[PDB]
Write an enzyme that holds these catalytic residues in place. Structure first.
Site, PDB file in Angstrom:
ATOM      1  N   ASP A   1       1.354  -0.361   8.200  1.00  0.00           N
ATOM      2  CA  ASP A   1       2.356   0.321   7.157  1.00  0.00           C
ATOM      3  C   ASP A   1       3.680  -0.681   8.754  1.00  0.00           C
ATOM      4  OD1 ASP A   1       4.201   2.156   6.105  1.00  0.00           O
ATOM      5  OD2 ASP A   1       5.279   3.202   7.663  1.00  0.00           O
TER       6      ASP A   1
ATOM      7  N   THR B   1       8.381  -1.479   4.034  1.00  0.00           N
ATOM      8  CA  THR B   1       9.086  -1.803   5.025  1.00  0.00           C
ATOM      9  C   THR B   1       8.810  -2.792   6.268  1.00  0.00           C
ATOM     10  OG1 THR B   1       7.611  -0.379   6.242  1.00  0.00           O
ATOM     11  CG2 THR B   1       8.962   0.851   5.317  1.00  0.00           C
ATOM     12  N   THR B   2       7.943  -3.572   5.485  1.00  0.00           N
ATOM     13  CA  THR B   2       6.950  -4.622   6.235  1.00  0.00           C
ATOM     14  C   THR B   2       8.239  -6.037   4.965  1.00  0.00           C
ATOM     15  OG1 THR B   2       4.652  -4.046   5.981  1.00  0.00           O
ATOM     16  CG2 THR B   2       5.399  -6.058   7.346  1.00  0.00           C
TER      17      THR B   2
ATOM     18  N   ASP C   1       3.007   6.445   1.491  1.00  0.00           N
ATOM     19  CA  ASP C   1       4.169   5.803   0.551  1.00  0.00           C
ATOM     20  C   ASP C   1       3.860   5.726  -0.524  1.00  0.00           C
ATOM     21  OD1 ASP C   1       4.597   4.553   2.707  1.00  0.00           O
ATOM     22  OD2 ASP C   1       3.405   2.966   3.379  1.00  0.00           O
TER      23      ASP C   1
HETATM   24  N1  LIG Z   1      -2.596  -7.073  -5.922  1.00  0.00           N
HETATM   25  C1  LIG Z   1      -1.618  -7.524  -5.651  1.00  0.00           C
HETATM   26  N2  LIG Z   1      -1.299  -8.936  -5.760  1.00  0.00           N
HETATM   27  C2  LIG Z   1      -0.008  -9.755  -5.348  1.00  0.00           C
HETATM   28  N3  LIG Z   1       0.492  -9.426  -4.233  1.00  0.00           N
HETATM   29  C3  LIG Z   1       0.211  -8.364  -3.903  1.00  0.00           C
HETATM   30  C4  LIG Z   1      -0.434  -7.086  -4.649  1.00  0.00           C
HETATM   31  N4  LIG Z   1      -0.006  -5.974  -4.490  1.00  0.00           N
HETATM   32  C5  LIG Z   1       1.202  -6.498  -3.597  1.00  0.00           C
HETATM   33  N5  LIG Z   1       1.287  -7.605  -3.600  1.00  0.00           N
HETATM   34  C6  LIG Z   1       2.409  -7.670  -2.990  1.00  0.00           C
HETATM   35  O1  LIG Z   1       2.465  -7.852  -1.718  1.00  0.00           O
HETATM   36  C7  LIG Z   1       4.050  -7.623  -0.874  1.00  0.00           C
HETATM   37  C8  LIG Z   1       3.999  -6.630   0.703  1.00  0.00           C
HETATM   38  O2  LIG Z   1       3.187  -5.366  -0.109  1.00  0.00           O
HETATM   39  P1  LIG Z   1       2.948  -3.955   0.895  1.00  0.00           P
HETATM   40  O3  LIG Z   1       2.290  -4.842   1.496  1.00  0.00           O
HETATM   41  O4  LIG Z   1       1.374  -3.463   0.028  1.00  0.00           O
HETATM   42  O5  LIG Z   1       3.693  -3.269   1.868  1.00  0.00           O
HETATM   43  P2  LIG Z   1       5.303  -3.737   2.456  1.00  0.00           P
HETATM   44  O6  LIG Z   1       5.636  -4.301   1.213  1.00  0.00           O
HETATM   45  O7  LIG Z   1       5.706  -2.884   2.826  1.00  0.00           O
HETATM   46  O8  LIG Z   1       4.271  -4.740   3.363  1.00  0.00           O
HETATM   47  C9  LIG Z   1       4.315  -6.824  -1.452  1.00  0.00           C
HETATM   48  O9  LIG Z   1       6.056  -7.805  -2.324  1.00  0.00           O
HETATM   49  C10 LIG Z   1       4.106  -6.814  -3.345  1.00  0.00           C
HETATM   50  O10 LIG Z   1       4.628  -8.071  -3.911  1.00  0.00           O
END
Ligand SMILES: Nc1ncnc2c1ncn2[C@@H]1O[C@H](COP(=O)(O)OP(=O)(O)O)[C@@H](O)[C@H]1O
Ligand SMILES: Nc1ncnc2c1ncn2[C@@H]1O[C@H](COP(=O)(O)OP(=O)(O)O)[C@@H](O)[C@H]1O
Ligand SMILES: [Mg+2]
Ligand SMILES: [Mg+2]
Ligand SMILES: [Mg+2]
Ligand SMILES: [Mg+2]
Lengths: 105, 364, 77, 147, 96, 540, 525
Positions: F72, F105-106, F403
């Protein structure tokens, strides 16, 4: 209008409804808690019946204050002084809203 | 000291193996009582052999199993060397006590201490149908002054507490009573206070207080009691000045500040039953004794001896004397070693020769 | 301290310009009171009691202990 | 506020009725005292001590302006400039003891909240010079000049 | 780090104005008052303790002034003029 | 260029303006902007490796040595110990994104770092930072309008929760609990849908009790439509299982009454003592009988009780629980449908809650017991009970489930969604670039820098997945331009397709809008600071 | 540019961070060090450690338990902390397998380091490990056998499991005696799962073979002064009342009188109240009275006058155990004697163990509570014996709860790794290499078991691998001679729950540690 932060709700506050469509608001400066009648008040009894009467009298004082508030028709209660858990549960039972420790401003 | 357990405990060895040896000495003292140096020497010798065995290339698991086999064979050999012993054979018990005391500073005073130990053990157990000895029944009292030749085997009990009732000593045909309540002004467990709003009440307060104290003392006296032991109290005064004066006026020896942990031993020795309320204080709960006298040890202190009790209890008391304190402690340890020898002779009634004979037989 | 990584202090722009002007003004104010017929002389003590009563600007500026580079420029001028 | 004893005050309750009636009686006494004060025509009350919550509530109920002055010198000066006598108790003021002023109001000068006791007539026992300025030191110097 | 930056060197003092003139005049007056009493046929002698352990018991103004160590430059100038008066004509040292 | 000023006057007199001015530090002009941009870039580049399903976890140690393993972003930035004020601003930006949205948040930190990095090269070319901020604001407005345009609406009905499950799975994909992906997503969706005012109102997280206990397996995490309690039955000999319980929730201790006012009861005679002890015994018996009269099968008290009441409850077949916390009392009352009673006199049958099963749960060889109050009729409170092989994965599961709950709450608040994997960012960058083409020259640079900074998210996602960033991002952008499909993004999981709608990678529209808004405002605020005055004392 | 290696400094004094290489190196070093330390205490030939405390007490411990070793060390490596917490949680869930799970996690992380050195993304390793864990779990579940239906077979399985658990501990010297002891103690619980009902008493002195399970119960309390020391056909009333200066719970009450005679009357009334309470207690028709709290002098005198044994200050555990062993009810009110159930036993007496005296209950009515007396030559020996017995009791209770059993001696690990290897051979890509590393660690576990014994571990592990590939699904290490044998015949049985927990916890900890690419430390206080 006016908006302010939530102020340390007691137990049973989540049972109160959180929306009213034409509420009467009871602005108070009153401590609705079970507490000593006065800081320099001492009760002297020599009978168990009087002991029970004193306990019931404190409870009746609190419930009389609560009944006077409730019978006014108000559905939202705000107070500067603390509102206890007993009063919070009492107002929750009547579908009323209470908020203690509201700041002066 | 000469005791192995005491030597190991007193010095902080700081090494884990040495601490293990200290615990081993403690265990040997618990189970047997003596032979505490021998077990540590044996363990050290075994490990000294183990170092060469390990250098020879032997895993320390074949060594352990082989040591277990050797231990079993050695137990068999020692049992084969045994000799049955009967508790009625006083000579064997005296010889065992003398052998136990031979290595101590009190070896010179053996002809006195060995029969003392034998009699002390024999007087706290039943020679028939006994499997253990509770050494807590043999109280040891250490008093400075004199020599080790002045050690005694008081059959009653001795108390270090001084007689509060000054002027009255040596009660003959004593009727001892042990109370656990307090002889003072009335007091309840609840918060209590007396409210005075008139001078008549002011006089009545102390008048009724003296009446209550006098009634308590009269109730105690009416049972024929003449020696009174009062348990130690903290919350309220166990013995007030008025109560002490009243008891002295009726010629009753008063002995206060009796420790709580001593009630069991005192009751077992005398036969008294503790009384916690005056309503239940009766003559049937008193301990009859032949003589309750406070003696002085030639200006080195005062002792209270209650010797001679109807239906004597299963306890004895040993008074240990000595020139200095160090020899007194070592004499106490030596007497304890002798008592433990007789105890471990009571259970597992078998006897073997000493002088290194069992060890050399084991080796061969 | 920073990305430049130079063992020393750095001043840039208005700060260094104001520093230079301040040093020049200090040098000027040292000798400004010794100009013209109504000027007055000065005593200079050389840390060991040596006294130099002088009115010449060159003597005053040579005897002084000057550290700032712009002040040194004015003194050598 | 309600006057209290000087040695020590203890509310001795021996029955349930006294416990249930004490606070109501105290509040009724406060209401009666404030009503008696307001019945003399007084519409501004100035006190030198603290103000009780119930007393303030009943002053608001009867439309009474409350001003609290900590300094005894300020209280004396206000009495001199208004014409009132500082009563030692909470009794209603008699006609001669009642003060009078042309206007009392809350106002803001700059960013400071002030309470003004204003006389329309160019008379009185005390006059106040309100000094404005851009610096505290400047106003101090002007005050020295005024002195 | 970050050593202080300044135009003139450290421990470089400077005084100006009426203060300097007043100090110079006061130093000269003090120097005069030192030997004020050593003038005339009824003058009384002064005993000076030399730093090297000697004793100078004299009535001459120049000797007294040259036996005294001072810090104020005006006093130094006064001692210098006394020495010059002594060297030029041989007396008048305490009068000048 | 530091230490304030050092002149000491042109007349040699002391020149002291500010207290301790020889110790304080000052940085002004473009150098301050460069330092701030470099610190922000460092923070963003540290945080960019934890983005996407293939992102890695930071493992933070506090000042007491306790270890936290987390993905997170807000938690990572909160755990950090920083002095730079821009770093504190980034931490506060992550906290703001967590508070308002709860997810992304990232992404905010990476976006802000990219924006400031582009602003650096814009500043090197002689552009006023206010102009850069204005261009960034204009481009952010364009991107937000485009996000509104390309959004899609999902159904938030309880009858069909599949879009909600997909969105929760997308949220949880980057977390360590993805080994139980669908299970965690479904329990989060059910938890949010259970405790929610249906008329699009708020979701009160105080009704979701998330508690974890070590042991078991992560797959053993379950949703309890009731309340979990850390307590147990007071008397060891009462039954450990109650069926069809009629619970009496009480906030009065089972003790003789005690007036609040200081009081003294005077005993003046033996008769008074006998009356007092009889009164105490009768009070105990009376409270027990009053509880039993309502027909209650179970009693719950908040303030504990003593031995006589305990044995009387055991003797009367009334399983009882004591020292229950106030929040737990409220949760039990809400779930079981019963009222909270302040004294036995007011206890009635109508105020009793109902639970289908109350049980005491053991946890292996730990002697610890906990209570389950479940099988309620229409429970409006829910509990998430998490298991794991160590406390660290338990904490990570807690924040991951938080989350997911926040994301479902966002869907309840607004049901419009966009497709992740960088598809939304790429489409917004394309829209910004197209808008910049028909715009005056000077702000074109700022808008194009904003587009390039927007492109950082797909590049980071591709880099974390082991692909070439520039090549894959360029190919995806070209495909998006060719066929009008803003759902094409980075195929991080190597499923063989770039259509992120088919892969069911869904994220809330309001989340992306809030990300863009917060990043733009923080970047503008940082760009406007041109002077730093630090104490510089380096105190201990 | 990273936070640490940037021209501007963003951290407090003392705060730092370790990037990819440094963080991975620190994690791997810590995990491998923990695993290497805890190992060599694994298997029948494992050796014990000495835990020498550096505190003021300077406590000394000798243990073979992995969790005990791991909890009593000051580790600053955060990955070491993760592994220590894993071992502690494993000990909490089941009583055995802490060393096994720690060693498995360490071996997995070592293989992960090797894979990272070969340019493999950690996410690929994680995916391969997840697939391998699924395959191994399925194989282990399919390999389990159950014998709960058959009483004699289940008892034999319990004996085998207790022996296998005790084989690695100091109790292996008297393994047979201690196994019988532990099995009897667990079976006396009558299906109850609580281990607090089994009390362990450690008395210094005597051989370890002198330890025994008492046929009744043993209490370490005392008896009143004038009370009987021997009761036959006891009727026991267990209570949790005051029995000491019992005051009415009206805290505002007080005595306000105008004379001392009234005070004397009030104190007589208090004594009469105590006497009436004792009379009400005696109305139950009892021989022995056990109270959780203290009993003062007046109540114990009354009990002695009534000829009733009065045992005081038997704490919550004591009264609960007495209730479980005698069937009585822990009462606090005595107004309804007919509603209170009294405990019963054939004889109460005082026994003499060592130099201490204890109260002995014989011929107990229920017996669902055990006391075990441990005798030893050293306090460290007693502590280690208690720890080993606790491990055995925990495993036996778990087996009673879940009767599914697997085969030990490396057989379960061998078949797990065989399934993992089959899956890896069936899978293309570097995930196949990750699963091969998983299987390599699974092989490494019995390799360490054999290494601790000094045998040819490589040859034995190769033989086990060949046997498990050829269909011999019960082949395992025969530590008696150093060869391979049939674990079913040799009776090397393990609890299925323990092995499953070991596998899953080790895989989970390895996965969570492997995901770390940055370690950021705040400035310590
Ligand atoms: N299955 C997936 N395949 C490709 N990209 C993904 C997938 N799931 C989430 N993402 C991308 O990863 C990015 C970061 O999401 P995440 O790390 O879960 O939380 P945060 O946005 O807080 O970093 C998001 O912008 C999303 O578009
Ligand atoms: N008699 C035996 N023969 C072969 N293997 C054994 C025997 N006893 C125990 N083991 C093995 O030793 C392994 C480790 O057990 P142990 O050393 O007690 O530590 P832990 O049980 O805490 O992991 C177990 O997996 C078990 O299979
Ligand atoms: Mg000896
Ligand atoms: Mg002359
Ligand atoms: Mg996310
Ligand atoms: Mg084991």
């Amino acid at each position: 209008g006016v908006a302010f932060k939530k102020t340390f709700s007691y137990a049973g506050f989540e049972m109160q409804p959180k929306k009213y469509h034409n509420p009467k608001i009871a602005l108070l400066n009153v401590e609705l808690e079970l507490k000593a009648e006065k800081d320099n008040a001492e009760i002297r009894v020599h009978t168990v019946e009087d002991y029970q009467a004193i306990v019931d009298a404190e409870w009746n004082i609190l419930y009389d204050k609560l009944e006077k508030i409730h019978h006014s028709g108000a559905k939202v209660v705000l107070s500067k002084l603390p509102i206890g858990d007993v009063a919070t549960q009492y107002f929750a039972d009547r579908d009323m809203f209470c908020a203690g420790r509201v700041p002066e401003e | 000291t000469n005791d192995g357990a005491t030597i190991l405990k007193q010095m902080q060895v700081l090494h884990p193996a040495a601490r293990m040896l200290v615990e081993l000495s403690k265990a040997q003292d618990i189970e047997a009582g003596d032979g505490t140096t021998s077990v540590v020497i044996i363990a050290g010798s075994l490990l000294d052999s183990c170092t060469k065995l390990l250098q020879k290339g032997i895993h320390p698991t074949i060594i352990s199993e082989s040591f277990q086999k050797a231990l079993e064979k050695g137990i068999e050999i020692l049992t084969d060397m045994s000799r049955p012993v009967e508790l009625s054979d006083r000579e064997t018990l005296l010889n065992s006590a003398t052998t136990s005391l031979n290595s101590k500073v009190v070896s010179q005073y053996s002809s006195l201490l060995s029969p003392m130990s034998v009699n002390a053990v024999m007087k706290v157990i039943d020679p028939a149908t006994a499997t253990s000895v509770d050494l807590r029944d043999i109280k040891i009292v250490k008093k400075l002054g004199g020599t080790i030749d002045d050690c005694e085997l008081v059959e009653g009990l001795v108390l270090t507490q001084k007689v509060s009732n000054s002027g009255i000593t040596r009660v003959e045909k004593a009727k001892i009573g042990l109370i656990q309540f307090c002889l003072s002004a009335p007091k309840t467990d609840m918060d209590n206070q007396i409210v005075v709003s008139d001078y008549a009440q002011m006089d009545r307060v102390l008048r009724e207080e003296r009446a209550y104290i006098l009634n308590l003392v009269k109730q105690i006296k009416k049972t024929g009691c003449n020696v009174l032991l009062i348990q130690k109290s903290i919350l309220r005064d166990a013995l007030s000045d008025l109560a002490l004066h009243f008891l002295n006026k009726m010629k009753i020896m008063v002995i206060k500040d009796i420790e709580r942990e001593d009630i069991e031993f005192i009751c077992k020795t005398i036969g008294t039953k503790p009384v916690a309320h005056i309503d239940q204080f009766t003559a049937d709960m008193l301990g009859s004794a032949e003589l309750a006298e406070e003696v002085n040890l030639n200006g080195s202190g005062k002792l209270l001896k209650i010797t001679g009790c109807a239906s004597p209890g299963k306890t004895v008391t040993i008074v240990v004397r000595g020139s200095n304190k160090l020899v007194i402690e070592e004499a106490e340890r030596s007497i304890h070693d002798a008592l433990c020898v007789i105890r471990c002779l009571v259970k597992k009634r078998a006897l073997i020769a000493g002088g290194g004979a069992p060890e050399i037989e084991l080796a061969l | 301290e920073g990305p430049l990584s130079v063992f020393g202090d750095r001043s840039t722009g208005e700060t260094i310009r104001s520093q230079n002007v301040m040093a020049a003004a200090s040098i000027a104010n040292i000798v400004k009171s010794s100009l013209g017929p109504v000027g007055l002389d000065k005593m200079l003590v050389d840390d060991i009691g040596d006294v130099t009563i002088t009115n010449d600007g060159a003597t005053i500026l040579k005897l002084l202990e000057v550290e700032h580079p712009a002040a040194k420029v004015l003194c050598e001028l | 506020d309600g006057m209290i004893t000087e040695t020590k005050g203890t509310v001795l309750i021996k029955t349930a009725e006294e416990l249930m009636n004490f606070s109501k009686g105290e509040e009724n006494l406060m209401d009666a005292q404030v009503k008696a004060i307001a019945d003399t025509g007084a519409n501004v009350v100035v006190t030198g001590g603290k103000v009780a919550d119930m007393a303030l509530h009943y002053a608001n109920k009867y439309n009474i302006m409350l001003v609290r002055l900590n300094s005894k010198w300020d209280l004396r000066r206000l009495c001199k400039t208004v014409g009132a006598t500082a009563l030692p108790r909470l009794t209603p003021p008699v006609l001669e003891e009642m003060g009078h002023c042309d206007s009392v109001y809350l106002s803001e000068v700059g960013d400071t909240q002030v309470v003004v006791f204003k006389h329309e007539k160019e008379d009185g026992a005390i006059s106040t010079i309100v000094l404005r300025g851009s610096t505290d030191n400047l106003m101090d110097d002007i005050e020295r000049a005024v002195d | 780090g970050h050593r202080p930056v300044l135009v003139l060197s450290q421990n470089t003092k400077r005084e100006s104005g009426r203060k300097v003139q007043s100090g110079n005049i006061n130093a000269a007056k003090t120097i005069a008052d030192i030997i004020r009493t050593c003038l005339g046929p009824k003058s009384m002698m002064k005993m000076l303790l030399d730093p090297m352990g000697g004793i100078v018991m004299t009535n001459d103004g120049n000797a007294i002034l040259r036996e005294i160590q001072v810090q104020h430059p005006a006093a130094k100038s006064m001692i210098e003029i006394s020495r010059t008066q002594d060297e030029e004509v041989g007396d008048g040292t305490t009068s000048v | 260029a530091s230490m304030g000023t050092l002149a000491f006057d042109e007349y040699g007199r002391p020149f002291l303006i500010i207290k301790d001015q020889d110790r304080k530090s000052r940085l002004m002009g473009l150098e301050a902007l460069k330092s701030h941009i470099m610190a922000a870039k460092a923070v963003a580049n540290t945080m960019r490796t934890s983005l996407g399903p293939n992102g890695l976890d930071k493992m933070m140690v506090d000042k007491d040595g306790d270890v936290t393993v987390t993905n997170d972003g807000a938690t990572i930035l909160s755990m950090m110990d920083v002095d730079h004020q821009i770093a504190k601003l980034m931490v506060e930006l992550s906290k703001s994104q967590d508070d308002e949205i709860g997810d992304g948040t990232t992404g905010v930190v990476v976006l802000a770092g990219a924006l400031l990095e582009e602003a650096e090269q814009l500043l090197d070319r002689g552009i006023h930072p206010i102009r850069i901020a204005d261009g960034y604001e204009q481009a952010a407005r364009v991107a937000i309008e485009h996000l509104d345009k390309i959004s899609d609406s999902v159904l938030v009905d309880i009858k069909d929760t599949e879009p909600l499950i997909q969105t929760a799975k997308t949220t949880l994909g980057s977390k360590v609990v993805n080994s139980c992906h669908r299970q965690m997503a479904e329990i989060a969706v059910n938890a949010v849908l259970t405790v929610a005012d249906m008329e699009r109102r708020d979701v009160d997280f105080e009704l979701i009790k998330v508690e974890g206990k070590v042991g078991g397996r992560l797959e053993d995490t379950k949703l309890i439509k009731g309340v979990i309690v850390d307590k147990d039955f007071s008397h060891p000999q009462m039954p450990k299982k109650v069926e069809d319980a009629k619970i009496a929730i009480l906030t009065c201790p089972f003790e003789p009454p005690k007036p609040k006012t200081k009081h003294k009861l005077d005993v003046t005679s033996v008769e008074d003592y006998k009356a007092l002890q009889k009164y105490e015994k009768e009070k105990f018996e009376e409270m027990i009988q009053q509880i039993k009269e309502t027909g209650a099968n179970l009693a719950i008290c908040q303030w504990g009780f003593d031995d006589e009441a305990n044995h009387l409850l055991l003797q009367n077949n009334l399983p009882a629980v004591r020292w229950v916390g106030g929040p737990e009392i409220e949760l039990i009352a809400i779930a079981t449908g019963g009222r909270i009673v302040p004294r036995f006199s007011e206890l009635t049958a109508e105020k009793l809650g109902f639970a289908g099963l109350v049980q005491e749960i053991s946890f292996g060889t730990t002697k610890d017991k906990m209570l389950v109050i479940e099988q309620c009729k229409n429970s409006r409170a829910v509990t998430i009970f998490i298991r794991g092989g160590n406390k660290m994965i338990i904490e990570e599961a807690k924040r991951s489930l938080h989350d997911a709950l926040c994301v479902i709450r966002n869907l309840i608040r607004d049901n419009r969604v966009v497709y992740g994997g960088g598809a939304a960012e790429i489409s917004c960058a394309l829209a910004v670039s197209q808008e910049a083409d028909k715009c005056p020259t000077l702000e074109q640079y700022a808008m194009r820098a904003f587009a390039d900074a927007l492109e950082v998210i797909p590049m980071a996602l591709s880099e974390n997945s082991g692909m070439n960033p520039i090549q894959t991002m360029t190919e995806v952008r070209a495909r998006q331009v060719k066929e009008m499909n803003p759902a094409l993004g980075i195929d991080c999981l190597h499923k063989g397709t770039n259509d992120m709608k088919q892969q069911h990678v869904i994220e809330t529209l309001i989340g992306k809008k809030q990300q863009i808004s917060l990043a733009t405002q923080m970047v503008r605020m940082i760009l406007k600071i041109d002077d730093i005055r630090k104490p510089g004392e380096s105190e201990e | 540019a990273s936070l640490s290696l940037a021209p501007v400094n963003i951290f407090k004094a003392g705060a730092d961070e370790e990037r990819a290489e440094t963080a991975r190196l620190t994690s791997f070093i810590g995990a491998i060090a923990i695993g290497d330390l805890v190992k060599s205490t694994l298997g029948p030939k494992g050796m014990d450690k000495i835990l020498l405390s550096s505190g003021r007490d300077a406590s000394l411990m000798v243990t073979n338990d992995g969790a005990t070793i791991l909890k009593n060390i000051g580790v600053d490596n955060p990955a070491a902390k993760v592994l220590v917490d894993m071992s502690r949680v494993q000990d909490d869930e089941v009583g055995d397998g802490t060393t096994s799970v720690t060693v498995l996690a360490a071996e997995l992380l070592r293989e992960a380091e090797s894979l990272i050195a070969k340019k493999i993304h950690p996410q690929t390793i994680i995916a391969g490990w997840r697939e391998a864990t699924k395959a191994a779990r399925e194989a282990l579940l399919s390999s389990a056998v159950d014998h709960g239906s058959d009483e004699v077979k289940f008892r034999q399985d319990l004996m085998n499991i207790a022996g296998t658990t005790l084989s690695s501990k100091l109790l292996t010297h008297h393994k047979d005696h201690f196994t019988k002891l532990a099995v009897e103690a667990v079976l006396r619980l009558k299906g109850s799962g609580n281990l607090e009902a089994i009390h362990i008493i450690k008395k210094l002195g005597g051989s370890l073979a002198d330890s025994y399970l008492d046929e009744g119960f043993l209490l370490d309390k005392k008896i009143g002064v004038n009370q009987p020391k021997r009761i036959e056909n006891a009727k026991i009333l267990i209570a949790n009342t005051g029995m000491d200066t019992d005051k009415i719970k009206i805290f505002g009450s007080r005595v306000r009188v105008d004379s001392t005679a009234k005070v004397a009357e009030i104190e007589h009334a208090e004594k009469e109240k105590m006497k009436e309470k004792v009379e009400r207690i005696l109305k139950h028709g009892i021989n022995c009275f056990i109270n959780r709290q203290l009993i003062y002098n007046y109540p114990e005198q009354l009990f002695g006058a009534a000829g009733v044994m009065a045992i005081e200050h038997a704490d919550f555990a004591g009264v609960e155990r007495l209730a479980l062993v005698t069937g009585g009810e822990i009462a606090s009110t005595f107004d309804h004697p007919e509603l209170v159930k009294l405990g019963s036993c054939k004889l109460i007496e005082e026994v003499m163990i060592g130099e201490d005296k204890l109260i002995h209950f014989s011929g107990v009515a229920l017996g669902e509570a055990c006391t075990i007396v441990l005798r030893g030559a050293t306090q460290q020996i007693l502590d280690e014996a208690e720890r080993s017995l606790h491990d055995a009791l925990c495993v036996l209770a778990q087996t009673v709860k879940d009767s599914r059993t697997v085969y030990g001696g490396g057989c379960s690990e061998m078949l797990m790794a065989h399934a993992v290897t089959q899956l890896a051979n069936r899978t293309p890509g570097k995930e196949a290499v990750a699963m091969e590393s998983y299987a390599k660690a699974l092989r490494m576990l019995p390799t360490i078991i054999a290494d601790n014994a000094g045998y040819d571990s490589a040859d034995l592990v190769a033989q086990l691998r060949a046997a498990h590939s050829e269909g011999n699904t019960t082949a395992g290490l025969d530590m008696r001679e150093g060869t391979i044998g049939d674990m079913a015949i040799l009776g090397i049985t393990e609890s299925f729950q323990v092995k499953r927990q070991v596998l899953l916890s080790a895989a989970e900890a390895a996965e969570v540690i492997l995901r770390v690419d940055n370690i950021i430390k705040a400035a310590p206080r």
